[PDB]
């Protein structure tokens, strides 16, 4: 059982927004389907749910005349359609499958809704740099909406890497990476700070250079 | 509109030792068919809820023999004979009997290992940060446990409360510990008007600070 969630991004208050799921891996016309969503506070909320043929449809009070919800059988396929978006409406949104005894038995990776009026900014990416350990970092600085990803050496160092989350403020997020190499490897050998942040289409790798 | 609660909000635990969930409905939960449809979910940092439990006490396919579901009525509990660091995270309780549904609002479950002193580092901006008219100056707070940590800034000697921010991770599984990210934010012009720069970290691994410091030379 496979679920995969897209469409979400950025839209402005009373916009409109369509969300994918596609499944696979089972009889999708035979289980009902549900969307839940969690918000920054990381409560999660049940939006709707759709039996197997499409007839029945139970949803959230307050996403009535706003929300739609349907499924393409032949084609493997749940949708929801946003319209009229409030800030309260922004979060990641999750599709899943239901299963006899149980509600949100198998759930997908999710996809990020943001609602709201900043203007989408790439990120600026800048070095961090300054025992046997030595701690480097990146910082990812005014950019907007989430995510953004990072990794060190093009994901050849994942053992003693961490990312923080990011802080909102002023409509820009920035957020910081730090990773821990022997001092011996550097700068002899590279460290280099890979940033990608989808919703500008925008690549960034950054060396780290000794001051 | 039915409601659910959940206690503790966070819950401290060592490796092996036991822990207890509870969740209370506002009323009951039992379906016109029968059923008590209270599941278990657990969200582990970093990735999508996970289904433990259904039907207030059946543990779904895959899912160790430690994990117990029981209660009855309006009042449930989520049981684990003997806690592995995986298991930690954000477990919520879920009805599914009447419309709308609902979930509790989650209960941190907290792995307790040997305290840990943070490993400091700080970072004077980058001459590309400069360039542009900026200078954010970065201290990261490196594994440490416990979670609570006091950071402060000095510049030349003294406090600055104003443009601070700061951002704690989860806590890791791997060990099991926490790190903090504390940022100060300045001009080029207000960062070129000091010298020292230092930020302090408070901790109960020790009575005095850890201070990390440098000159802008």
């Known amino acids: 059982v496979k679920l995969v969630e897209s469409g979400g991004g950025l839209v402005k208050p009373g916009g409109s927004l369509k969300l994918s799921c596609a499944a696979s891996?089972?009889?999708?016309?035979?289980?009902?389907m549900s969307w839940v969503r969690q918000t920054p506070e990381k409560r999660l909320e049940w939006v709707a749910t759709?039996?197997?043929?499409?007839?029945?449809?139970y949803s959230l009070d307050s996403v009535k005349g706003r929300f739609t919800f349907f499924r393409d059988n032949a084609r493997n396929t749940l949708y929801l359609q946003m319209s009229s978006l409030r800030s309260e409406d922004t979060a990641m949104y999750f599709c899943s499958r239901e299963n006899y005894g149980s509600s949100f038995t198998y759930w997908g990776q999710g996809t990020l809704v943001t609602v709201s009026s900043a203007k989408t900014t790439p990120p600026s990416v800048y070095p961090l740099a300054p025992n046997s350990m030595v701690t480097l970092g990146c910082l990812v600085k005014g950019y907007f909406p989430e995510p953004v990803t990072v990794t060190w050496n093009s994901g050849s160092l994942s053992s003693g890497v961490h990312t923080f989350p990011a802080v909102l403020q002023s409509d820009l997020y920035t957020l910081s990476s730090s990773v821990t190499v022997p001092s011996s490897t550097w700068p002899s050998e590279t460290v280099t700070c890979n940033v990608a942040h989808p919703a500008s289409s925008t690549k960034v790798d950054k060396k780290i250079v000794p001051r | 509109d039915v409601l659910m609660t959940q206690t503790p909000l966070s819950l401290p635990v060592g490796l092996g030792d036991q822990a207890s969930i509870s969740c209370r409905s506002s009323?009951?939960?039992?379906?016109?068919?029968?059923?008590?449809?209270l599941e278990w979910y657990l969200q582990k940092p970093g990735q999508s809820p996970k289904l433990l439990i259904y039907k207030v006490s059946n543990r779904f396919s895959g899912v160790p023999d430690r994990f117990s579901g029981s209660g009855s009525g309006t009042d449930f509990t989520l049981k684990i004979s003997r806690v592995e660091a995986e298991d930690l995270g954000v477990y919520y309780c879920f009805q599914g009997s009447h419309a709308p549904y609902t979930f509790g609002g989650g209960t941190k479950l907290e792995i307790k290992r040997a305290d840990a002193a943070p490993t400091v580092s700080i970072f004077p901006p980058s001459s590309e940060q400069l360039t542009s008219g900026g200078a954010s100056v970065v201290c990261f707070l490196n594994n440490f446990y416990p979670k609570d940590i006091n950071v402060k800034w000095k510049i030349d000697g003294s406090e600055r409360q104003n443009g601070v921010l700061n951002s704690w991770t989860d806590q890791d599984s791997k060990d099991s510990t926490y790190s903090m990210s504390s940022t100060l934010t300045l001009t080029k012009d207000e960062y070129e008007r000091h010298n020292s720069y230092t930020c302090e970290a408070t901790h109960k691994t020790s009575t005095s600070p850890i201070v990390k410091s440098f000159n802008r030379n």
């Open positions: 009323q009951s939960i039992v379906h016109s068919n029968g059923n008590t449809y």
């Open positions: 891996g089972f009889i999708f016309s035979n289980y009902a």
């Open positions: 759709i039996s197997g043929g499409g007839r029945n449809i």
